[PDB]
Design an enzyme around this catalytic site. Structure first.
Site, PDB file in Angstrom:
ATOM      1  N   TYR A  50       2.098 -52.942  -3.072  1.00  0.00           N
ATOM      2  CA  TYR A  50       0.960 -52.353  -3.773  1.00  0.00           C
ATOM      3  C   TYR A  50       1.353 -50.977  -4.295  1.00  0.00           C
ATOM      4  O   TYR A  50       2.122 -50.260  -3.653  1.00  0.00           O
ATOM      5  CB  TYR A  50      -0.246 -52.202  -2.843  1.00  0.00           C
ATOM      6  CG  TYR A  50      -0.849 -53.492  -2.279  1.00  0.00           C
ATOM      7  CD1 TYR A  50      -0.596 -54.728  -2.851  1.00  0.00           C
ATOM      8  CD2 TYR A  50      -1.677 -53.447  -1.160  1.00  0.00           C
ATOM      9  CE1 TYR A  50      -1.183 -55.896  -2.346  1.00  0.00           C
ATOM     10  CE2 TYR A  50      -2.262 -54.595  -0.648  1.00  0.00           C
ATOM     11  CZ  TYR A  50      -2.000 -55.819  -1.232  1.00  0.00           C
ATOM     12  OH  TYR A  50      -2.551 -56.960  -0.698  1.00  0.00           O
ATOM     13  N   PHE A 205     -16.622 -61.016 -10.666  1.00  0.00           N
ATOM     14  CA  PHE A 205     -16.086 -61.386 -11.977  1.00  0.00           C
ATOM     15  C   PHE A 205     -16.930 -62.487 -12.604  1.00  0.00           C
ATOM     16  O   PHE A 205     -17.327 -62.391 -13.765  1.00  0.00           O
ATOM     17  CB  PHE A 205     -14.646 -61.871 -11.822  1.00  0.00           C
ATOM     18  CG  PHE A 205     -14.005 -62.307 -13.111  1.00  0.00           C
ATOM     19  CD1 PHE A 205     -13.322 -61.397 -13.902  1.00  0.00           C
ATOM     20  CD2 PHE A 205     -14.077 -63.629 -13.525  1.00  0.00           C
ATOM     21  CE1 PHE A 205     -12.727 -61.800 -15.097  1.00  0.00           C
ATOM     22  CE2 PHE A 205     -13.484 -64.037 -14.714  1.00  0.00           C
ATOM     23  CZ  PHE A 205     -12.809 -63.122 -15.500  1.00  0.00           C
TER      24      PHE A 205
END
Ligand code: ATR
Length: 287
Positions: A50, A205
């Protein structure tokens, strides 16, 4: 904030965890992590992959300097070695396990990692070999517990036979329930904790796409919470062994996520939610 035993080896975490991925402006990232802790969240999740060159682990490490380290459970991971046009390449040789672990210890600036996951399975190295080095790291005190992510039933069973697996991180939400048929039962048979990632994001989403549904919103209103809290509450209710790690970059959404723990849903409530997700003419559309 309730605390739960994740797996059977002794790991204990806050019922809600926090995913740090999204955080990788530093001061403000640190502030979100600190406020999560002030809200009783003690379980923080990252990975070497990440950010840029391990910047998410570096961020968490800086945040930790403002917290009582020994009160926090740090989850991080290794395994993704390169990403390119052809796709993601995993590596699980013992040398790589150890070098990744040391690099994570250094970036987090900690003496040990609580929960260290295989982020992606190396399909060219028998899983016993990878787990063997993780077992050595546990015995040396470099890590306390081992996790897997996105692993097949066969990989889970073979791993666990070498050294007990503390947690499996997999996608799970109202919108993604594939693990229910085989993975969940298997984890329960073996005593392995379940750590849902994307417990709300896929639904958010979708909600946005459909916006630009009502059954879910009416159920949240009925239960006195927001649609996202309902989604997170549904995941929370799937077992005492389920600890989701939603991420956010906003304090207001952090507080909203914590608020989801307040929601109480009966078996019947839960089915109703699941089931919802496979003047004379002044009328409105039916639910
Ligand atoms: N209470 C909340 N309301 C609305 N969006 C939220 C939210 N909590 C998290 N999110 C969003 O949900 C996303 C995180 O979802 P997730 O943890 O389930 O993981 P993933 O990215 O894998 O889908 C982020 O986009 C986050 O955006 P913000 O940083 O703006 O918060």
């Amino acid at each position: 904030m309730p605390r739960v035993k994740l797996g059977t080896q002794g790991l204990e975490v806050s019922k809600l965890g926090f995913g740090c991925m999204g955080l990788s402006p530093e001061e403000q990232g640190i502030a979100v992590i600190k406020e999560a802790f002030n809200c009783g969240i003690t379980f923080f999740d990252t990975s070497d992959i990440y950010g840029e060159n391990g910047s998410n682990e570096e961020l968490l490490g800086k945040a930790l300097k403002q917290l009582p380290r020994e009160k926090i459970q740090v989850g991080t991971k290794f395994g993704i070695h390169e990403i390119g046009f052809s796709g993601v390449k995993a590596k699980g040789t013992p040398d790589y396990v150890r070098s990744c672990c040391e690099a994570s210890l250094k970036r987090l600036d900690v003496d040990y990692i609580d929960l260290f996951y295989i982020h992606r399975i190396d399909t060219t190295v028998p899983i016993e070999i990878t787990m063997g080095e993780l077992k050595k790291l546990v015995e040396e005190g470099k890590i306390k517990y081992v996790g897997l992510s996105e692993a097949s039933p066969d990989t889970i069973r073979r791993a666990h036979a070498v050294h007990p697996v503390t947690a499996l991180q997999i996608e799970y939400s109202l919108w993604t329930r594939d693990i229910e048929d085989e993975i969940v039962p298997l984890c329960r048979q073996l005593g392995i904790g379940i750590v849902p990632y994307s417990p709300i994001g896929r639904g958010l989403f979708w909600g946005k796409a459909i916006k630009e549904y009502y059954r879910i919103e009416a159920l949240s209103q009925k239960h006195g919470c927001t649609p996202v809290q309902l989604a997170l509450a549904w995941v929370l209710h799937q077992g005492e062994d389920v600890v989701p790690i939603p991420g956010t970059t906003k304090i207001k959404n952090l507080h909203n996520n914590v608020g989801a723990l307040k929601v109480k849903l009966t078996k019947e409530d839960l089915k109703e939610i699941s089931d919802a997700v496979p003047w004379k003419f002044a009328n409105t559309p039916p639910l």
